[PDB]
Write a protein that binds this ligand. Structure first.
Ligand SMILES: [Cl-]
Length: 318
């Protein structure tokens, strides 16, 4: 290729011998790769935009946020966020395809509409940044959230397009906020973008703390907690519940990478990987894809080598 690939809020999956990468961007931006390093543009999920997006977000600009990709019964489920900066006029949608290869006769994204929507003054959460997790009991869950009253988990219905009925919800992580604050304001609870990975006997909840998207002043970083059951509670290394501000440091930025986060995490062929964006100080703070090897310490906690922020170098192909 020649330049690193620029992404925000990345997720990944493999179909056959091809890797696919999904990013925040117009219609959700999709790339493909044979080796996880050299990436070509593949498609955008929506050629224009979801038919319903403007009614949720009247000033919608075409950019969909924070995708999650999930394989289930032979299909590909791509969750995506419609929102507006600074507000909780937001909704998570899902669109489904039979395959990820755009040359395939089976290739077509079909929107299934709104999974969940937040409404100002009704909901103390923000319906963005979905992540899908299955448990040991045949059930599938969505975690999501950003600012307001924090991160939530709810049970999905049988087709994975709406909340199961009757509904079942759980709070999984939170930072301080008084309800006397105006309901329309994001607050000081700088927590977002949950992602859950099952490893050994625990579920691990990753979350982003601090502020993204602000050049030299970004404080964005990753913290983690763990729970025996998918529904919590997620505790940190000191035994503090993430519902009361717990979370142990996984990785933070340095002089070259000022802010990093909004991660995913995967087990591929018996090894584990952390997938994130990081803002490159030497290139106008432009967010680059980073894939790091995910290790586990003697106490059962994830660990990464921050040197891989430099040695993992994606390439954008023609
Ligand atoms: Cl995400």
């Amino acid at each position: 290729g020649a330049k690193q690939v620029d992404v925000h809020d990345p997720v990944m999956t493999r179909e056959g011998d091809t890797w696919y990468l999904f990013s925040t961007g117009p219609g959700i931006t999709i790339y493909s790769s044979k080796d996880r390093v050299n990436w070509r543009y593949s498609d955008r999920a929506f050629a224009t935009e979801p038919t319903w997006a403007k009614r949720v977000s009247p000033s919608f600009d075409g950019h969909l946020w924070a995708p999650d990709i999930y394989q289930h019964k032979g299909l590909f489920y791509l969750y995506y966020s419609v929102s507006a900066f600074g507000k909780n006029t937001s909704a998570i949608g899902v669109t489904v395809n039979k395959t990820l290869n755009p040359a395939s006769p089976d290739y077509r994204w079909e929107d299934k509409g709104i999974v969940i929507e937040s409404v100002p003054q009704r909901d103390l959460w923000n319906a963005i940044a979905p992540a899908i997790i299955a448990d040991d009991h045949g059930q599938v869950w969505m975690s999501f959230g950003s600012f307001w009253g924090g991160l939530k988990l709810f049970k999905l219905n049988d087709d994975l397009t709406r909340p199961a009925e009757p509904q079942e919800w759980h709070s999984i992580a939170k930072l301080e906020r008084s309800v006397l604050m105006d309901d329309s304001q994001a607050g000081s609870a700088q927590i977002e973008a949950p992602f859950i990975l099952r490893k050994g006997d625990y579920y691990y909840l990753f979350a982003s703390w601090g502020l993204c998207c602000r050049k030299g002043d970004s404080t964005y970083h990753l913290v983690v907690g763990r729970s025996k059951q998918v529904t919590g509670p997620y505790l940190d290394k000191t035994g503090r519940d993430m519902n009361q501000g717990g979370g142990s440091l996984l990785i933070k930025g340095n002089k070259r990478w000022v802010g990093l986060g909004h991660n995913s995490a995967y087990t591929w062929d018996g090894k584990d990987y952390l997938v994130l964006h990081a803002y490159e100080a030497a290139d106008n703070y432009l967010q680059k894809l980073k894939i790091l090897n995910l290790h586990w310490d003697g106490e059962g906690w994830p660990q990464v080598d921050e040197k891989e922020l430099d040695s993992y170098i994606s390439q954008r192909l023609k």
